[PDB]
Amino acid sequence: CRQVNVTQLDGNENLIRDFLFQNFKEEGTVVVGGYYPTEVWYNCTAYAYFNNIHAFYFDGKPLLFHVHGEPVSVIIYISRPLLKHGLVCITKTRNVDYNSFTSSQWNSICTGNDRKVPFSVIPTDNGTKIYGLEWNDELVTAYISGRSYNWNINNNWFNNVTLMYSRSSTWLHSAAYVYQGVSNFTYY
Ligand SMILES: *[C@@H]1O[C@H](CO)[C@@H](O[C@@H]2O[C@H](CO)[C@@H](O)[C@H](O)[C@H]2NC(C)=O)[C@H](O)[C@H]1NC(C)=O
Ligand SMILES: *[C@@H]1O[C@H](CO)[C@@H](O)[C@H](O)[C@H]1NC(C)=O
Ligand SMILES: *[C@@H]1O[C@H](CO)[C@@H](O)[C@H](O)[C@H]1NC(C)=O
Ligand SMILES: *[C@@H]1O[C@H](CO)[C@@H](O)[C@H](O)[C@H]1NC(C)=O
Ligand SMILES: *[C@@H]1O[C@H](CO)[C@@H](O)[C@H](O)[C@H]1NC(C)=O
């Protein structure tokens, strides 16, 4: 909705250079290519829609976004075990109510046959590292802090995500999240 230089924020000066040098641990020069985030990000019961994207990056304020796929879809909800802000819901179902998901209690949200995984957003890096997701029809990569985790799942991803940025009060009404979707093969 509104563009923002992501490197001009506080604590986000080196959140990108710390990401392009994750795997390059040698001395010298090299040109790399991939779905790498750019400098201009997007700070903006509200919804946002990204289409034709291959990766999704972003940087206790709550956020929610749903990655569409068949026959399994992914829900990431950052808001209950102690110091476990984030939740991953591997929904095998189709359309899901994004309001009843957040308004209801955390004890019964991702229930039924849907897999629930509570993960700890590290509240000690002061939001100075990129959080991200990347997917193809064979592998799903998650970037949290400075490490990459892989999952092997055979899915049919639709390359679009649904994002919730505004709602009424596990949800505190605030806007402290920047996000971006990557669709082109960028070189650094
Ligand atoms: C994400 O993309 C998928 C795949 O294109 C969309 O699913 C199709 O949506 C169209 C309308 O745009 C329907 O006519 C098709 O029947 C849908 N196909 C399937 C297999 O579901 C989906 O709507 C997109 N979602 C968002 C939120 O943009
Ligand atoms: C980013 O900063 C440059 C100057 O460094 C400015 O011209 C540009 O408009 C900014 N882009 C934004 C705010 O989207
Ligand atoms: C995060 O901020 C705290 C509070 O100022 C500081 O003690 C800590 O070292 C910071 N962590 C970093 C810079 O990795
Ligand atoms: C995004 O912009 C809004 C509206 O101007 C502002 O309140 C908010 O602080 C910005 N968010 C960040 C993380 O900079
Ligand atoms: C991706 O690059 C093409 C040219 O290769 C350009 O036309 C298109 O607008 C780019 N897409 C985005 C989302 O920036």
What this model shows, in words?
5% of the residues lie in helices and 39% in strands. By secondary structure, the protein is mainly β. β10 (131-135) and β11 (139-144) form a beta hairpin. The radius of gyration is 17 Å and the shape is globular. The structure holds a molecule of 2 linked components (NAG-NAG) and 2-acetamido-2-deoxy-beta-D-glucopyranose (4 copies). The site of a molecule of 2 linked components (NAG-NAG) has 6 residues, from β4 and β13. The PDB classes it as viral protein.
List of distinct ligands in this structure? a molecule of 2 linked components (NAG-NAG), 2-acetamido-2-deoxy-beta-D-glucopyranose
Give me the side-by-side strand order of the main sheet. Answer: 4-13-6-7-8-9
Classification by helices and strands = mainly beta
Order of helices and strands: EHEEEEEEEHEEEEEEE
Oligomer: part of a larger assembly
For the termini, the CA-CA separation is: 26 Å
**What proportion of the residues form beta strands (DSSP E)?**
35-45%
Radius of gyration: 17 Å
Estimate the global geometry from the Cα principal axes. Answer: globular
Discrete helix count: 2
- Fraction of helical residues: under 10%
The main pleated sheet reads as: 6 strands, antiparallel
